[PDB]
Amino acid sequence: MASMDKVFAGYAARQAILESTETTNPFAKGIAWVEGELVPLAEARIPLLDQGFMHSDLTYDVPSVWDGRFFRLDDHITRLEASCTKLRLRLPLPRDQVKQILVEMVAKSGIRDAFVELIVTRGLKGVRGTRPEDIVNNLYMFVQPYVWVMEPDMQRVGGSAVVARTVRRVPPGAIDPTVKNLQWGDLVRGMFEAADRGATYPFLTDGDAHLTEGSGFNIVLVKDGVLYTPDRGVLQGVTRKSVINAAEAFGIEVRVEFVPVELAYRCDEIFMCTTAGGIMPITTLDGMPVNGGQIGPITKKIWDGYWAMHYDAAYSFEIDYNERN
Amino acid sequence: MASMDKVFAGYAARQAILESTETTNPFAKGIAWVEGELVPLAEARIPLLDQGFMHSDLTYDVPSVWDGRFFRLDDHITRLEASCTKLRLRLPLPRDQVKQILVEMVAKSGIRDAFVELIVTRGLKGVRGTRPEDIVNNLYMFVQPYVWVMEPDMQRVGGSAVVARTVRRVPPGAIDPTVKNLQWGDLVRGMFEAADRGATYPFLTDGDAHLTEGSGFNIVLVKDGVLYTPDRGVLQGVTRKSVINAAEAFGIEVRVEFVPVELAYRCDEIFMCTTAGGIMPITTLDGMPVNGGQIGPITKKIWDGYWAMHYDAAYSFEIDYNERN
Numbered sequence A, B: 001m002a003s004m005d006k007v008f009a010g011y012a013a014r015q016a017i018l019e020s021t022e023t024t025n026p027f028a029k030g031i032a033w034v035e036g037e038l039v040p041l042a043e044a045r046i047p048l049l050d051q052g053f054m055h056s057d058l059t060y061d062v063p064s065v066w067d068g069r070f071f072r073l074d075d076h077i078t079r080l081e082a083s084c085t086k087l088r089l090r091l092p093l094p095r096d097q098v099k100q101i102l103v104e105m106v107a108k109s110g111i112r113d114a115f116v117e118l119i120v121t122r123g124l125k126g127v128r129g130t131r132p133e134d135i136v137n138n139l140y141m142f143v144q145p146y147v148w149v150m151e152p153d154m155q156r157v158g159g160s161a162v163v164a165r166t167v168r169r170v171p172p173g174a175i176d177p178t179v180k181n182l183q184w185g186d187l188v189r190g191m192f193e194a195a196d197r198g199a200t201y202p203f204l205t206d207g208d209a210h211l212t213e214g215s216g217f218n219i220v221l222v223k224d225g226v227l228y229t230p231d232r233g234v235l236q237g238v239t240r241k242s243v244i245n246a247a248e249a250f251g252i253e254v255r256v257e258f259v260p261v262e263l264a265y266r267c268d269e270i271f272m273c274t275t276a277g278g279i280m281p282i283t284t285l286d287g288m289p290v291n292g293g294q295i296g297p298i299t300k301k302i303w304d305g306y307w308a309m310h311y312d313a314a315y316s317f318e319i320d321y322n323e324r325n
């Protein structure tokens, strides 16, 4: 219930070092792997005919680095492989080589707090009209400075959400939300709706009176000392997984189940969770304060627990930035 | 009711001529417009950070050229602008300039039968966390040899379809299907399902016992001299529009309305329609011959009518090759 000052101050200090190197290190603003070559992220290009662009025929995943430590990298690569399997894709390199490249990329960038993305696409030939044996999947990877879906200043007070009414989440029988994907048509609609309504974060329903997820995050409700989070219709987030780990360590019950929309209007606390920002409190919903409008005690406990895990060998490992090896 | 021989023979003759130019015209296999530069299609590259790739945050449209005549180009540009408006995008160049560039591209390629695609993306900055004033949309365009969703020799016989059971169409309240888009998660699932079931084409339902569309085409049923095609849940196809034009000219009623799945099992004829292939008969459905399994008389009449429209000044214009239209 009190790690924010230190977590954010550490980040600010590391950030200041990174920023100072932007004119000397061409990778300080990010680095990409394309067709076996490493290039500054702003200069990275992909073939126009890649079906990842032509029909968003891809999956992706986003591990992260915090304070020079990769967080749950194996979980993210395993989820990527699972997503590939569901799409009949195959990770184009052995996963141990992939890990080695990522660590090399991070080390070269000098970035201590990083957003790391891997993308596997169908390749230069589409599914339609192609012999399955002629299909060759493509891999793209990049590392960039850590991305905040909720900035540190706002995490201190909580953000503003709406339950979206002009859009609902793509259902699993159309697109499987457990397959991480970049088909964000509904999520972008949600972001526009939130903004139109004077808020920031959209919570999308399943179009059947139950909650799913938002534009880049899972949703957790807190009521009478219990956490509630949607089971079906959502990405099985690694942050959400970490929230469950922390809750279990603290003796807090977590129910991963169908969550009726009505619970969002009568719960004690709300937070979002995602790799790109961590634990993100929501203190206004549909223009109304959430139970008084302050960040709640269980949210604070989970917040602290989540960041503590980033230093636990069971969930993280230290990257060697030395040059080299 | 028999224009197939002449239409396909003409195409074959033009294909042979096109092929003979490939060793001397670097654009004969296709040409792309990227950031104001014209490049061979295979060499075209886009920024990795373009949000058209990063979150498929884009719309697109696909006019075509047949026998050196652009087909309904104005309709396609108008639909593109409509799609852009619905996504809060804006065509980055005046539409008259866009048409001029397209004609120039086709002429340089020397392609007489062409698939032409325009893509408008959100640009290098995403909706999330960006000042709306800081967003600059991007334009990509390319011309390639005509693409067949059903090959000419399969159109002579008819194709096999299934009503998909493992996937349904993304509903409009999640992603608006009247906005042409490349978020094909459900459509690719449909293609895999069709293949798994020994058929070529998937027909997707609305997940509520009514038909919508398939993987790159609209669906038309013929029953007792009347055409039926889904109103809601689908792209408002320009080919479908052309089918309606031809049918009205022929005195054939067309009902654009809710089409129950059951009608597909008791109708007299079925065909698919799309810019990438035209009029595409379906003669087996779920492994069962459609009303005897032969291409039907109304399908043939529409087939002929559709291709005749490609030479009709009301619907087309001739491109001036080596001099621009």
Ligand SMILES: Cc1ncc(COP(=O)(O)O)c(CN[C@H](CCC(=O)O)C(=O)O)c1O
Residues within 6 Å of the ligand: A061, A062, A147, A213, A214, A215, A216, A217, A218, A234, A235, A236, A237, A238, A239, A240, A273, A274, A275, A276, B128
């Ligand atoms: C739809 C969706 N649901 C849930 C999550 C949370 O899952 P995890 O805890 O495994 O991260 C994400 C993460 N999406 C953000 C990217 C969003 C952006 O950059 O705008 C991420 O990959 O972290 C997401 O995109």
Ligand SMILES: Cc1ncc(COP(=O)(O)O)c(CN[C@H](CCC(=O)O)C(=O)O)c1O
Residues within 6 Å of the ligand: A128, B061, B062, B147, B149, B213, B214, B215, B216, B217, B218, B234, B235, B236, B237, B238, B239, B240, B273, B274, B275, B276
């Ligand atoms: C989902 C969908 N519905 C209907 C249609 C028919 O609409 P129109 O008659 O306006 O073309 C298309 C055409 N999409 C094809 C896909 C091409 C491909 O798969 O390679 C196109 O863009 O021409 C489509 O993609």
Ligand SMILES: [Ca+2]
Residues within 6 Å of the ligand: A066, A067, A068, A069, A318
């Ligand atoms: Ca450390």
Ligand SMILES: [Cl-]
Residues within 6 Å of the ligand: A010, A011, A013, A014, A067
């Ligand atoms: Cl530190």
Ligand SMILES: [Cl-]
Residues within 6 Å of the ligand: A079, A082, A083, A178, A179
């Ligand atoms: Cl999974």
Ligand SMILES: [Cl-]
Residues within 6 Å of the ligand: A165
């Ligand atoms: Cl509301």
Ligand SMILES: [Cl-]
Residues within 6 Å of the ligand: A170, A175, A176, A177, A181, A183
């Ligand atoms: Cl999805």
Ligand SMILES: [Cl-]
Residues within 6 Å of the ligand: A317
């Ligand atoms: Cl290791």
Ligand SMILES: [Cl-]
Residues within 6 Å of the ligand: B010, B011, B013, B014, B067
């Ligand atoms: Cl000819």
Ligand SMILES: [Cl-]
Residues within 6 Å of the ligand: B061, B062, B063, B238, B275
């Ligand atoms: Cl089209």
Ligand SMILES: [Cl-]
Residues within 6 Å of the ligand: B075, B076, B079, B237, B238, B241
């Ligand atoms: Cl139109």
Ligand SMILES: [Cl-]
Residues within 6 Å of the ligand: B165
């Ligand atoms: Cl079935």
Ligand SMILES: [Cl-]
Residues within 6 Å of the ligand: B170, B175, B176, B177, B181, B183
């Ligand atoms: Cl769609």
